[PDB]
Design a binder for this molecule. Structure first.
Ligand SMILES: CCCCCCCCCCCCCCCCCC(=O)OC[C@H](COP(=O)([O-])OCC(O)COP(=O)([O-])OC[C@@H](COC(=O)CCCCCCCCCCCCCCCCC)OC(=O)CCCCCCCCCCCCCCCCC)OC(=O)CCCCCCCCCCCCCCCCC
Ligand SMILES: CCCCCCCCCCCCCCCCCC(=O)OC[C@H](COP(=O)([O-])OCC(O)COP(=O)([O-])OC[C@@H](COC(=O)CCCCCCCCCCCCCCCCC)OC(=O)CCCCCCCCCCCCCCCCC)OC(=O)CCCCCCCCCCCCCCCCC
Ligand code: HEA
Ligand code: HEA
Ligand SMILES: CCCCC/C=C/C/C=C/C/C=C/C/C=C\CCCC(=O)O[C@H](COC(=O)CCCCCCCCCCCCCCCCC)COP(=O)(O)OCCN
Ligand SMILES: CCCCC/C=C\C/C=C/C/C=C\C/C=C\CCCC(=O)O[C@H](COC(=O)CCCCCCCCCCCCCCCCC)COP(=O)(O)OCCN
Ligand SMILES: CCCCCC/C=C/CCCCCCCCCC(=O)O[C@H](COC(=O)CCCCCCCCCCCCCCC)COP(=O)(O)OC[C@@H](O)CO
Ligand SMILES: CCCCCC/C=C\CCCCCCCCCC(=O)O[C@H](COC(=O)CCCCCCCCCCCCCCC)COP(=O)(O)OC[C@@H](O)CO
Ligand SMILES: CCCCCCCCCCO[C@@H]1O[C@H](CO)[C@@H](O[C@H]2O[C@H](CO)[C@@H](O)[C@H](O)[C@H]2O)[C@H](O)[C@H]1O
Ligand SMILES: CCCCCCCCCCO[C@@H]1O[C@H](CO)[C@@H](O[C@H]2O[C@H](CO)[C@@H](O)[C@H](O)[C@H]2O)[C@H](O)[C@H]1O
Ligand SMILES: C[C@H](CCC(=O)O)[C@H]1CC[C@H]2[C@@H]3[C@H](O)C[C@@H]4C[C@H](O)CC[C@]4(C)[C@H]3C[C@H](O)[C@]12C
Ligand code: CUA
Ligand SMILES: [Cu+2]
Ligand SMILES: [Mg+2]
Ligand code: NA
Lengths: 44, 75, 513, 56, 227, 258, 72, 75, 72
């Protein structure tokens, strides 16, 4: 296995903009989920 | 008679057993007084106390079960 | 190689990283739920138009924050990363079982999010009291999916507790006694003992609820001779230990952080700190019925539970004064982690003191099931746990990643979060004293001003959360690689560099007698 | 029965780079593939069931 | 009832609520002082260039840190428990009233003498009479005599509820199959409000309690009228 | 390495175990609510496959590869004791439910224990026999332990076979008891406490018996040495735990509760 | 030693099981079933069981387990 | 009435509690009936049973103690 | 080790004794003695005691221990 800074993680930090997209999708998906579950329950 | 007095047998916040015991006592006494054709006025203290303490729905359910033969207390 | 490393892990560091990622994601969910709560309450009337959905949101908010954010971050994340490093151990005792404690949590979370998506959700409160949680008042699958979520979380934490206790007892250097282990390691061992003893009792109680819902048992159903109050005893027998479980690793991290940024080699009064954590753990099992002062128990029982509960203040005060005495005479480094730790000491103290107010059963009659209780636990638990987590996170991020944070950004983040949580929760004391019930979707008009302010505070904390994500991005984006840190002589976890190699302590430390 | 532990020691200590769960030979591969296929397929089926149950 | 911008407890309507106010004042003074001391000491520890980083002996100071908190806790517990045992003390009630919780309203039973019972529902906001209180009014108030010891018995016909009246110091859970007792004594006539205080499902926020306290003569006239 | 601890090969079984838990729980949900056993039978199958391969690998790592140094064995000892402690606390919850219900019988029961309409089993008939069976199996497993320590293959196998036979006898007696019982799990809190507490105990007897059967086959294949046999020790500890829980059930539910 | 524990196994433990087996077998006769009474705290049905017709317990014995409506 | 029938509450050789229970039941019933000025004839079953079962000296001692205020049973 | 048992002595055992001493201290003080009733199962005298006047128990407390004839 690869060792050292940026290599001990399951995501790439090779490109800061690809990283920004992945972090956006990751934390954004979690934050969004309760709003969409509330929407799902209301639309019942 | 105004209301049921303090009963040292049932001194705590949970009064469930106080309602139950007076309901049993009234119906045991009523059965005892009827069976010799005696006088149910002797049972009056228990009647007033259970009527004061017991929820109407508990009394009504217990009455129904006595009539059904499914009342689980001994009378 | 990617599947072998990240799905098939037997490495304490990689499993710790998985727990930190999981917990951070869970924190976003929990935060979103908290903002939906405060949006419903932020003006008088109804926002969602569906009070069952409000009750589902409140219930999910608590389960996510407790089971999927705090415990995974503190025990699974910091515990797995730091405990083996702090005792010079090459891994955990059961490195493969460790991986299953982690992989049980995504399924557990999926069951919770299934509960909320089927039928009308579990609008029960995180207490899940019958008969509201029973098969009449909550017919259908939602409550059963919540029960199963808690079974999987419980198995994860019981197996984790076995792993941590075995590791800490069995895998120190042969010369190192228990009284030469760092306070964080003590805090995890004690937490693990509480989990091992408390979770099985919760498992029994929620299993009884499952069978009352599906197999026609009547543990909690008076028609069969059961008792809803039995459920409350079994739940709280777990639930009081659980609140000490949530804080104890936090107390351990605070001890390390205060010692480190005071420039000290050691915390003040080490054996007193060990004594205090063990005393809190023990007393934590004999106080549970202070959650039940309004259910109709005997006066002498209320008197006992008041008195026993108040005793916990004594060992707790020893820890608070010991943290102050660790600052005393320090060469203070005003790092962002130090700011988190000082915020912790003060905000934890405020919440602990409102706990002592509530311990008085007489006054608890008026405060029970009001916003006073919500205010108490958002100080001691919500702010205490979160401030300890953020202090540990900014302190140890460079160890785990190999990269430095921007300290000025981290200080801005602290300042925003301090304002937001105090604006959110301080006014809830007034709402409680003035009689506003908890678990309400709307309130009498008199309560409008403090609800409005509380909801405005909740948005300030949201701004802090968003900024935290940017700050982590900026550290990974800039790639400032750590060279040196100070005080390695009394902080062994740093001595293999940043990040440490996949395998550390292949050659163990040398410690003589 | 005869003590064949030495023969198993030799098999499981062979320097072939295999992880312990595959070191017994081709049967380990079959049992792993059956297990993982049922787990992953079952999980996809559980998500389908969630989708079905999420609506009236 | 609560009023806008209220910081503390509703004004006491019963002697036991008065006791609780005095006891809270005592306890809050301690909370303030300890909170303030901890903040002050943090500020003191952080505001000197002087240093002492060598090992410090903890034994002497831990005596102060355990004895002083133990004394404070005793000084809170003594009055706390005095009030606890006052609120349990044998009273001779002159009246017993039952309340049953339901999803989502209260019923009341006055069965000392007549089988009087009725249901008590929140007045919807669209039906409030001018000047009436949103989420707090009911159709049928709990008429009770003032300056008299009353026994309230609390249960439920479905899920858990909790019968509360803050200005009287009252909160008693409503548990099906259980009959919980509390004592009510109002020093004053008037209207006293409370709200369901155990989560009982979608309309938990909307099943309030309203007591109407009147002189005995008016309570008797009301009872007699109900025949 | 120059430490004595075991760095475990990367393994799929944690993930297959975690997914088996999802399938069993989602499966029970789909059985109780959506009239279907499909997910549940997949979950039970993957759970058994996971436990088989995981413990097979522990045998490979120890008997075949030599990774269980004394330090590793010491850790496993602690792990098994802590696991038993967690199981004690699980049972404690069921005993608490039993004592809560039986010490304060509610009016629905007739305000008595046993409730009106409940006809308990005679604790001097099959329950006493079950007691003699598990106590006897505690003696036979101790004989097995001493035989193994003394290097006696034949007597270890005979003693362990007798222990397993007694566990099976208990299980068949309890199955028979369940079928003959005139009360059911639906007979109020008496049936609830009886069947859930004795049913989790019966499950633990089946688990313990299975563990003894694994030890029997490992012994037939000469895995154990006279000094190194932690799987046997753990199975004996677990078996004693099952005995002791039975004695508490017998005194509490069958005897005092009759 | 092993010899002592074998002695206890064959000399005390298994004889005990043989005597309890004889005791049980002598008392194994079918008891006369009690009159059915539809008590509301027994034969609980809050949800149908997930097997059979929903109204039979898992190890239902027609001889001794009445349904809510009585013996089959 | 010939003698006291079999009582399933007291099925064993020791009949002490049978005598005691019927003596208590008679005196409780008599007190309940005399207080209202009702009729002690309704108590007659308990009277016949305790008189059949109880040794004369036990009855005599218990009566003396009721008169003295030293009877330790609840009537 | 000795260190751990000293830790338990001073950290758990003696604090427990201090708390139970506090508890007993707070609930001390004389309760009102009950009306004397010459129950025949109490104040047993089948033989005089071998000390004093034969009618006083060994640790007789005049405040709470009545004689067969009542309080002194
Ligand atoms: C309710 C459910 C509960 C869910 C909770 C979710 C939260 C739990 C998270 C736990 C973490 C899971 C990690 C497991 C492995 C990830 C597998 C994967 O998909 O890889 C792609 C992805 C990485 O993408 P990459 O940059 O291309 O890296 C590829 C490799 O470098 C190069 O390697 P490669 O080329 O060999 O292989 C890479 C390739 C393919 O490689 C493979 O062969 C992998 C295939 C199997 C992987 C399956 C993973 C299962 C994950 C389950 C969730 C747990 O991957 C891809 O690019 C495509 C896969 C994309 C799949 C999406 C997975 C996202 C995670 C879940 C998010 C939640 C969504 C739920 C929606 C909710 C709606 C209601 O991995 C991640 O998911 C990583 C997390 C995302 C970034 C987050 C950054 C945050 C940083 C904050 C720091 C705070 C903590 C401090 C840490 C301390 C520093 C040390
Ligand atoms: C930073 C982030 C932003 C912060 C968030 C902003 C929150 C809103 C500000 C509140 C201002 C309230 C107000 O209008 O004050 C007028 C109010 C006018 O006085 P008043 O109407 O005559 O009230 C006298 C009452 O009879 C007094 O009797 P009472 O029964 O009506 O009042 C009792 C009540 C009211 O207590 C108070 O008077 C205010 C509490 C002190 C705030 C600090 O106190 C509580 O029980 C609150 C619970 C607190 C738990 C423990 C907190 C520890 C404090 C930490 C110490 C640090 C020292 C620095 O002035 C204040 O008392 C200031 C507050
Ligand atoms: C981190 C989590 C955590 C922690 C550590 C605590 C700590 C305490 N809690 Fe709290 N509590 C919760 C989380 C926590 N709590 C939660 C989640 C609930 C609600 C559950 C629900 O209903 O959903 C709750 C509810 C709860 C109740 C029930 C209230 C009700 O529902 O009506 C009570 C009752 O006594 C209680 C008391 C305390 C006490 C006395 C402490 C003590 O341990 C505090 C000790 C600390 C101090 C006292 C401050 C430091 C001390 C000093 C500076 C020394 C000097 C001090 C004195 C002399 C007083 N809390
Ligand atoms: C740890 C526990 C915890 C945490 C953190 C929180 C956080 C918050 N909670 Fe609360 N909450 C509970 C536990 C918690 N809560 C519980 C147990 C209940 C009772 C449920 C019931 O009644 O049944 C409750 C209920 C509750 C109510 C009462 C609802 C009602 O009675 O109707 C309210 C009302 O305002 C509220 C608000 C908030 C807000 C605004 C936040 C936050 O927005 C405050 C700010 C904190 C954050 C935003 C978190 C930041 C952390 C991360 C994002 C993790 C980062 C990760 C890494 C760095 C690795 N919560
Ligand atoms: C012979 C000795 C032992 C036998 C073992 C039992 C066989 C079937 C099931 C096995 C699992 C047992 C565990 C205990 C769970 C609950 C009930 C089991 C007790 C039992 O078998 O009771 C039976 C009922 O079973 C029923 O309802 C049906 C039960 C089937 C479905 C149970 C599903 C519930 C599972 C709960 C999961 C909880 C897991 C906890 C994990 C915690 C981790 C933290 C009794 O039969 P009856 O006809 O009512 O009365 C007899 C009348 N002649
Ligand atoms: C702090 C407590 C420690 C105890 C020390 C106190 C007393 C002397 C020795 C005690 C030995 C123990 C038991 C002997 C029997 C009786 C004493 C019981 C304990 C006691 O001291 O009982 C007292 C009575 O003592 C009495 O009769 C006094 C009786 C004195 C003579 C005792 C007769 C000796 C009996 C023979 C012993 C036989 C031993 C056989 C050995 C076996 C060989 C096979 C109680 O006082 P009281 O006023 O009735 O009530 C209190 C009212 N306020
Ligand atoms: C029809 C059946 C339906 C029921 C299915 C449910 C499951 C039943 C499973 C029964 C458990 C079987 C466990 C087998 C373990 C085999 C591996 C083993 O025993 O491994 C041993 C280590 O022990 C170790 O890991 C110790 C491992 C401890 C395992 C503990 C197992 C108890 C598990 C209970 C399961 C959860 C139940 C909870 C439910 C509420 C290996 O070391 P040694 O023995 O020293 O050998 C080495 C020498 O040869 C060197 O000379
Ligand atoms: C509704 C139904 C919901 C229930 C879902 C069930 C949950 C999950 C599915 C379970 C899948 C189990 C698969 C087998 C797990 C075996 C674990 C084990 O045996 O772990 C061992 C450690 O734990 C030890 O000993 C002692 C610990 C052994 C524990 C065995 C497994 C227990 C699982 C359930 C327990 C619940 C406890 C009940 C109390 C509440 C070995 O540790 P490893 O790190 O592997 O290796 C270390 C090497 O040095 C060995 O050579
Ligand atoms: C190897 C990886 C594993 C892959 C997963 C396999 C997926 C199998 C899909 C089959 O789906 C089934 O369809 C049945 C028929 O449509 C359903 O029957 C049930 O549903 C019926 C609906 O008609 C009812 O009559 C009954 O409850 C019952 O027969 C049953 O619920 C469902 O499982
Ligand atoms: C609660 C706030 C702060 C509390 C601080 C209490 C710290 C007490 C320090 C005791 O340490 C001592 O200081 C002395 C020198 O002055 C030394 O001479 C002595 O050897 C040393 O042990
Ligand atoms: C002949 C054979 C030798 C085994 C060996 O050393 O390989 C013996 C030794 C002990 C025997 C076992 C024990 O005597 C106990 C059991 C006795 C039963 O009558 C048959 C099965 C039973 C389980 C036996 C099977 C088999 O005959 C074993 C295994
Ligand atoms: Cu009724 Cu809340
Ligand atoms: Cu608590
Ligand atoms: Mg409540
Ligand atoms: Na609202």
């Amino acid at each position: 296995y690869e060792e050292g800074p940026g290599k001990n993680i399951p995501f790439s930090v090779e490109n800061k903009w690809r990283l920004l997209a992945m972090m956006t999708l990751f934390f954004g998906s979690g934050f969004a989920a309760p709003f969409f579950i509330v929407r799902h329950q209301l639309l019942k | 008679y105004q209301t049921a007095p303090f009963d040292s047998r049932f001194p705590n916040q949970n009064q469930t057993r106080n309602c139950w015991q007076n309901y049993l006592d009234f119906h045991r006494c009523e059965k005892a007084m009827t069976a010799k054709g005696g006088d149910v006025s002797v049972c009056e203290w228990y009647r007033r106390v259970y009527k004061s303490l017991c929820p109407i729905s508990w009394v009504s359910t217990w009455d129904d079960r006595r009539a059904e033969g499914t009342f689980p207390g001994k009378i | 190689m990617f599947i072998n490393r990240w799905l098939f892990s037997t490495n304490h560091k990689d499993i710790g990283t998985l727990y930190l990622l999981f917990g951070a994601w869970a924190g976003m969910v929990g935060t979103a739920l908290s903002l939906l709560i405060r949006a419903e309450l932020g003006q008088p009337g109804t926002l969602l138009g569906d009070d069952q959905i409000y009750n589902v949101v409140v219930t999910a908010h608590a389960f996510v924050m407790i089971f999927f954010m705090v415990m995974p971050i503190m025990i699974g994340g910091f515990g797995n990363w730091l405990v083996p490093l702090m005792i010079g151990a090459p891994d955990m005792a059961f490195p493969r079982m460790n991986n299953m404690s982690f992989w049980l949590l995504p399924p557990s979370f999926l069951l919770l999010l299934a509960s909320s998506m089927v039928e009308a959700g579990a609008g029960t409160g995180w207490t899940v009291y019958p008969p509201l949680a029973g098969n009449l008042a909550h017919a259908g699958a939602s409550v059963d999916l919540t029960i199963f979520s808690l079974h999987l979380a419980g198995v994860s934490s019981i197996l984790g507790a076995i792993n941590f206790i075995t590791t800490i007892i069995n895998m120190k250097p042969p010369a190192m006694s228990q009284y030469q282990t760092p306070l964080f390691v003590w805090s995890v061992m004690i937490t693990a003992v509480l989990l091992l003893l408390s979770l099985p009792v919760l498992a029994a109680g929620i299993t009884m609820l499952l069978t009352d819902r599906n197999l026609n048992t009547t543990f909690f159903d008076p028609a069969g001779g059961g008792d809803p109050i039995l459920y409350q005893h079994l739940f709280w027998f777990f639930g009081h230990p659980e609140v000490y479980i949530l804080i104890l690793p936090g107390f351990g991290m605070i001890s390390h952080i205060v010692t480190y940024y005071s420039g000290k080699k050691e915390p003040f009064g080490y054996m007193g700190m060990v004594w205090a954590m063990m005393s809190i753990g023990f007393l934590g099992f004999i106080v549970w019925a202070h959650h039940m002062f309004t259910v109709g128990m005997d006066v002498d029982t209320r008197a006992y539970f008041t008195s026993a509960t108040m005793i916990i203040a004594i060992p707790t005060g020893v820890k608070v004064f010991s943290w102050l005495a660790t600052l005393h005479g320090g060469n203070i480094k005003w790092s962002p982690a130090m700011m988190w730790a000082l915020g912790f000491i003060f905000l934890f103290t405020v919440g602990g003191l409102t706990g002592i107010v509530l311990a008085n059963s007489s006054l608890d009659i008026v405060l029970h099931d009001t916003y006073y209780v919500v205010a108490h636990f958002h100080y001691v638990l919500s702010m205490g746990a979160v401030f300890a987590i953020m202090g540990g996170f900014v302190h140890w991020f460079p160890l785990f990643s190999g990269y430095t944070l921007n300290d000025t950004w981290a200080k801005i983040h602290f300042a925003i979060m301090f304002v937001g949580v105090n604006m959110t929760f301080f006014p809830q004391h007034f709402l409680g004293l003035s009689g506003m019930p908890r678990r309400y979707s709307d309130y009498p008009d008199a309560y409008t001003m403090w609800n409005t302010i509380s909801s405005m505070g909740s948005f300030i904390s949201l701004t802090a959360v968003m900024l935290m994500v940017f700050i982590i991005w900026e550290a990974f984006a800039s790639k400032r690689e750590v060279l040196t840190v100070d005080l390695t002589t009394t902080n062994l976890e740093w001595l293999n560099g940043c990040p440490p190699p996949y395998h550390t302590f292949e050659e163990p430390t040398y410690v003589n007698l | 029965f005869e003590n064949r532990v030495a023969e198993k020691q030799k098999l499981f200590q062979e320097d072939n780079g295999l992880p312990v769960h595959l070191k017994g030979g081709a049967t380990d591969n079959i049992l792993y593939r059956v297990t993982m296929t049922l787990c992953l397929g079952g999980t996809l089926y559980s998500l389908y069931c969630l989708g079905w149950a999420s609506f009236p | 009832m609560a009023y806008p911008m209220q910081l503390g407890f509703q004004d006491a309507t019963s002697p036991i609520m008065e006791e609780l106010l005095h006891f809270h004042d005592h306890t809050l003074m301690i909370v303030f002082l300890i909170s303030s001391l901890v903040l002050y000491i943090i500020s003191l520890m952080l505001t000197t260039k002087l240093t002492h980083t060598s090992t410090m002996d903890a034994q002497e100071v831990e005596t102060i840190w355990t004895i002083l908190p133990a004394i404070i806790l005793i000084l809170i517990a003594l009055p706390s428990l005095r009030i606890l045992y006052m609120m349990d003390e044998i009273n001779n009630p002159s009246l017993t009233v039952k309340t049953m919780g339901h999803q989502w309203y209260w019923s009341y039973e006055y069965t000392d003498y007549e089988d009087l019972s009725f249901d008590s529902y929140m007045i919807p906001t669209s039906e409030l009479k001018p000047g009436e209180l949103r989420l707090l009014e009911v159709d049928n108030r709990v008429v009770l005599p003032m300056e008299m010891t009353i026994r309230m018995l609390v249960s439920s016909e479905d899920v858990l509820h909790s019968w509360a009246v803050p200005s009287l110091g009252l909160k008693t859970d409503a548990i099906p199959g259980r009959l919980n007792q509390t004592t009510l004594m109002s020093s004053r006539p008037g209207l006293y409000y409370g709200q369901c205080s155990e989560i009982c499902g979608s309309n938990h926020s909307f099943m309030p309690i309203v007591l109407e306290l009147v002189p005995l003569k008016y309570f008797e006239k009301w009872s007699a009228s109900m025949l | 390495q120059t430490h004595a601890y075991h760095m475990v090969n990367p393994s799929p079984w944690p993930l297959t175990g975690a997914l088996s838990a999802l399938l069993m729980t989602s499966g029970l949900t789909m059985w109780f609510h959506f009239n279907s056993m499909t997910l549940l039978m997949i979950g039970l199958t993957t759970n058994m496959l996971t436990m088989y391969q995981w413990w097979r690998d522990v045998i490979r790592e120890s008997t075949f590869q030599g990774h269980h140094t004394p330090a590793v064995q010491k850790g496993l000892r602690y792990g098994m004791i802590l696991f038993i402690i967690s199981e004690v606390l699980f049972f404690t919850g069921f005993f608490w439910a039993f004592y809560h219900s039986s010490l304060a019988p509610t009016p629905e029961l007739g305000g008595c224990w046993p409730p009106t309409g409940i006809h308990p089993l005679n604790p001097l008939e099959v329950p006493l026999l079950n007691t003699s069976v598990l106590l006897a199996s505690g003696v036979s497993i101790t004989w097995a332990h001493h035989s193994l320590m003394e290097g006696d293959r034949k007597h270890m196998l005979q003693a362990l076979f007798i222990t397993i036979t007694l566990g099976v006898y208990f299980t068949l007696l309890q199955a028979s008891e369940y079928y003959e019982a005139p009360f059911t799990i639906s007979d109020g809190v008496y049936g609830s406490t009886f069947f859930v507490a004795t049913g989790f105990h019966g499950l633990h007897v089946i688990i313990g018996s299975t563990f003894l059967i694994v030890c029997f086959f490992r012994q037939l294949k000469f895995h154990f040495t006279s000094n190194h046999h932690f799987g046997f020790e753990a199975a004996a500890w677990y078996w004693h735990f099952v005995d002791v829980v039975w004695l508490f059930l017998y005194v509490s539910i069958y005897w005092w509760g009759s | 030693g092993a010899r002592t524990w074998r002695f206890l196994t064959f000399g005390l433990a298994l004889p005990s099981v043989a005597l309890c087996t004889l005791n049980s077998w002598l008392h194994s006769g079918h008891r006369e079933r009690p009159a059915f009474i539809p008590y509301h705290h027994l034969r609980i049905r809050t949800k149908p069981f997930s097997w059979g017709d929903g109204n039979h317990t898992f190890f239902h014995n027609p001889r001794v387990n009445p349904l809510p409506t009585g013996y089959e």
